[PDB]
Design a protein around this ligand. Sequence first.
Ligand SMILES: OC[C@@H]1[C@@H](O)[C@H](O)[C@H](O)c2nccn21
Ligand SMILES: OC[C@@H]1[C@@H](O)[C@H](O)[C@H](O)c2nccn21
Ligand SMILES: [Ca+2]
Ligand SMILES: [Ca+2]
Lengths: 714, 714
Amino acid sequence: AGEITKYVNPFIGTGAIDGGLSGNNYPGATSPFGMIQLSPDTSEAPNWGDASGYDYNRNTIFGFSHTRLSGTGASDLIDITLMPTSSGRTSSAFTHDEEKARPGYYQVMLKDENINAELTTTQRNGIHRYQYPAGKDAEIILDMDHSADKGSWGRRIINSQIRILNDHAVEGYRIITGWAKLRKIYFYMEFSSPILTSTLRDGGRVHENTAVINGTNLHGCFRFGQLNGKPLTCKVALSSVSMENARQNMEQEAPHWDFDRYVAAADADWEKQLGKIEVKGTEVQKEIFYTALYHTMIQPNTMSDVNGEYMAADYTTRKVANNETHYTTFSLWDTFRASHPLYTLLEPERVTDFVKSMIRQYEYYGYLPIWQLWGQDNYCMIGNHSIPVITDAILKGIPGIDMEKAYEAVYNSSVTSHPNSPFEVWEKYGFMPENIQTQSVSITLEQAFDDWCVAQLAAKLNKDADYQRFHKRSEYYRNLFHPKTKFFQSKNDKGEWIEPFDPYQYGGNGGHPFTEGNAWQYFWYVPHNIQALMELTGGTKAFEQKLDTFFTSTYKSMNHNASGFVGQYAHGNEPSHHVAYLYNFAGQPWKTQKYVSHILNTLYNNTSSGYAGNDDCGQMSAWYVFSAMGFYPVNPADGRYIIGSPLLDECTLKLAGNKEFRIRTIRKSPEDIYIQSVTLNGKKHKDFFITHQDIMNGGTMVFKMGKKPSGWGK
Amino acid sequence: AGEITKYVNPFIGTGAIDGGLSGNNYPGATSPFGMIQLSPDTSEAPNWGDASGYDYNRNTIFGFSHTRLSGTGASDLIDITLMPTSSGRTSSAFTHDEEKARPGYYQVMLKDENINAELTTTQRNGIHRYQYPAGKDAEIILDMDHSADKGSWGRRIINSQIRILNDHAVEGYRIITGWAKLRKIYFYMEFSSPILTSTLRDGGRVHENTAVINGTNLHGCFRFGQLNGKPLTCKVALSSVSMENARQNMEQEAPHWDFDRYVAAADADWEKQLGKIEVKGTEVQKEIFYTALYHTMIQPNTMSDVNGEYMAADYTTRKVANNETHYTTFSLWDTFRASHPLYTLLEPERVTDFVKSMIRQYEYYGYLPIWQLWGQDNYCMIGNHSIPVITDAILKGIPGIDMEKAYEAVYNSSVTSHPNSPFEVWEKYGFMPENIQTQSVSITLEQAFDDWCVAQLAAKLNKDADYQRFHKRSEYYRNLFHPKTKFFQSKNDKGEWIEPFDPYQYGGNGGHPFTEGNAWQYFWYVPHNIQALMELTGGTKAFEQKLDTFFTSTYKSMNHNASGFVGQYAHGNEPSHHVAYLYNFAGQPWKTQKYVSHILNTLYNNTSSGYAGNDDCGQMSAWYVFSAMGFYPVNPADGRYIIGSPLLDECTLKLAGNKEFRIRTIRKSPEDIYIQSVTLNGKKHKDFFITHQDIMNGGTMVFKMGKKPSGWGK
Ligand SMILES: OC[C@@H]1[C@@H](O)[C@H](O)[C@H](O)c2nccn21
Ligand SMILES: OC[C@@H]1[C@@H](O)[C@H](O)[C@H](O)c2nccn21
Ligand SMILES: [Ca+2]
Ligand SMILES: [Ca+2]
């Protein structure tokens, strides 16, 4: 018990060094792909700098809430907040010295009044256990106002309710706006001891011992008297649909009152999840690796209730079939790159539900998700990056996906214009003109890649006319390639290059042709035709040389999303993430190995500041998981993984059937970062990639490593 | 055909004279107690001065929307707006000369482009017919942004959609805030001719021939080409729950495309409704009377869909039983006085659903409605005036009401404190202190009356302890009766009379102890113990004298809700409405008859400015209906109607069974306003009231009238 789970350190990514963006992870309890993230908030109102609610540099806890995002650069959720107290207090100091976390478990001693808080979860319930000093009164404060910063996104509470049903049960809801336009969060809560007195309020309006209150700024205080020394256990279930659903969620998943038993089931559940990859390496490597793997598995989030009901993207209540689960929290601009490829390896059964969930947005909203939060699109970032995810699953043969319905959704999302996707402009110009559509160069590149995916899906279904159309569109990166400067640059609607152009200059999220990066970084974004890109650059040697400049040029111009620098390579944001693997394509695999190894060893660590930037729903972590094993999905829809440099001594992927993909290394020391040779299933392996089918068949792959570059693949 | 419906003039109450508040009625098509109010908007953004959307003093139509309130002093709804055009225009001039309206039908010639618009409805569908000139293009503009004034109530569109399903079908929705906190309006629309081209937009973002758009500021234009000379018919169904429900609403109620047939069914439906009272009088009287009766029957509004589903007050989707309908639009501060009593006479089957609907708010929200709009409370005005309505129905024996569940709702709404109802303050002080709860005197009086109702209901169910409690509370008006001045006046929490006090001074809706009136007007609000009030005033002669001062004192101090003045009596707002009947209680029935007759003949007319103030969901109209027949529910929960002065020569109420209550007059001329004697079922009638049971038994009542006061009841 705890062989693997003891390696996860939930505090990795919860802080930042001295400036530089936090990982924005949280240390509190959750379950795999769960609905509940039960965690302390170290802010009264979480914002972009502490978007999960927890910041390791802070020393005050303002309550325990039940929902949040992991690693995002904008805050939302933070719903249903409990705080223990003996004297109506709403905050407490704490120290990291008297605080612990592990998969499914969080504990902290609240110092102001010496109350011990422990947290665990099921898929849809949060479970609390609070120990008050003997001789002191036990109270719980319920805060329904506490949320992400109300000065952002037009965020306000439209309406809410707290309703005491009996001496051990409370229910309510909040309807709230924000980064997601409209969310409804219903709850059902029970206590292990009877409520003796209580107070409800809405702002300055206070009602003593009153069974219900409605309003926009609601707070409850429940008083249990002297319980010395019995702990108070609280159970809280949520739903996007109704209080009835939430109650039913509790009846099915959390009927009992054995706290330690919930803790043990969460740990067991996490041991099975993390056990999908058995690794061998140093103790620090296993900590960093299993923590990263944990970060990939805490979302997408369960949205449907145990009865299958969910709020759909048309704001109506719908129901999935009995063997299906509706998911949300799709940070797709990030997660299409590595996280979704990882789920095809470890979570094929869940991938079918992720895809079905994406398709429901098309069905009820008109196009697939761009960035999805609480069952609805918020259009964050760029592209239509459901498309690679859905394409990749289908091409790989992930079972249970209706391919014709999936194609309809992908096709219609690629021809029906919508914000940041003016498709008539796209097909008329063969690029996005900056004066018509901003973030034009980044969109042109990323959308071109989305279009390649559509083409591959059309080819699979024998839709020849569609293949031509979308293949031609996949080639529109060519229309922005400048033949003198050899960068992709912005043009206007007259077909003229905008001048002046500085390839070091950062753009934001509009008002500039690049999205949270510069032209140096976006140059590499032709993942579906690296051969064409190399040719345009002047051939393999010229392409190698440009990569060398990229990795060594230290000019600081600036966007705060960019950090974790290797020259102009910025590991802290995701446009760079595929680039270190590109030396393979240029005939210098040793340089990929050199740079990958440098990033793994130098831009990740096992402290609070352990990621180079925002984790972004586990994308930064997924990069580590992939790269540490020794390969990466450069084109996340072609079913190939490009070999880098294996960090760990061994890795074993557990697959369906009783199959295993066994990765092994022959090395003398940790200096042995260069690949001398590779074998797959006993035959010498002559390519710089392994296929998805090679992995899912089961088999074994051996790397002979060495301290010096060989001529392998060179 | 049209014997009765030809008397209704929908333009009565749609204007105002030269200042003074409009009736705020609308002339467009609707069905009895319907979901759809299909009517032109003469404003871009309706506000308090034109809250239904139509103002008779205006000459431009900005579209035809499908929802509104009748006669309210605040605007909401105004959802789903169509406008015909031949050249993308969004407004048109019109004249009353080329415009018509009658129950279930509205027509207007739009002058700018010579397009004829006709409108009718079913319970849940709006039906349009537009005739374009031969040789001109047919287009429809769909405006999803058009609404009540967005500068009030924090009103904004959270999200919306327009989605073209095929060449003849469009669906969508809007989610919007306002006077009601959150409303979701889903629609399904069909055209009689195929859409040839189209445009959708969200603000400046325009998408040509695109099947769907999402956003907060959406507009569609649909182009049908040259249809000369076939009219374009449009059908539009709504739902509070889903597009599927809306479609199903159309399939059940409006499958066909015969416009004239829809018109005829609406007229037939209205003929049965208005036929519940057959009246004889002058032609002008029948116009004023049947129009008033129409105004009482256009709300409460159907909210549940044909499958029984509705949005409940916890914002969840629920379903009523197959023989039930969920209603909303309960303007209770107004309608508890006369409109709800009228529904007990004419609409007992609907009253059961109204009561069930009120109880659903208690079940899902925690207390009964105060003022209900689109299935939720907005707390407008004062009191808990569901209570008289629910009490009155139960005491009268309206069938199908669960009395124990109803009592639970009434009781819990009377002891669970909530905004404007601090019940612990109430029971500690025996009044509302002005420094703790504003509008204190008006609330004290009205809440005292609500409490009498609870007491009567407790007595009916043999709950003796409850009877005492609420009877004692019904007497709290005594604690604000000033023994020197003989007015009800405000006190502070030390029990001290606030000074100075001016009984002419108007209050608003907070910051003053009276609600949209002065102390002169609120003095009469002890409807449940007029005997006690007369005694406190110094006896019947003193009480008579105070009424005389009230009806003759012309001092102008001012609140714009108060208008239609007879001295300090202000017919234009509803605190005054019972007062002319109080001379009966004082031993001077002839003075009631004098003043009632004066109000009927002088403060109502058959022009656009035909009401003395806001109709308030038919309360002003209900006053006319009752008073013209010759009696009024002074205490709207004791099942007595106080005799005034019958205006009409005859009236016949059609009741269940084949029963009739036949009211007849013996008179020589219209000067004969004074009652000489009364007979009921052939026996001489010695009381100044008739009972509800006397009416519902069927029978006949004869008034001998004369030009001069008799000593009848004197
Ligand atoms: O969190 C949402 C998005 C991310 O998808 C993306 O990685 C981007 O870097 C970013 N900065 C702030 C917010 N975001
Ligand atoms: O329309 C809602 C309420 C009415 O219930 C009431 O008659 C009052 O006079 C009033 N003035 C403006 C709005 N209102
Ligand atoms: Ca990022
Ligand atoms: Ca009024």
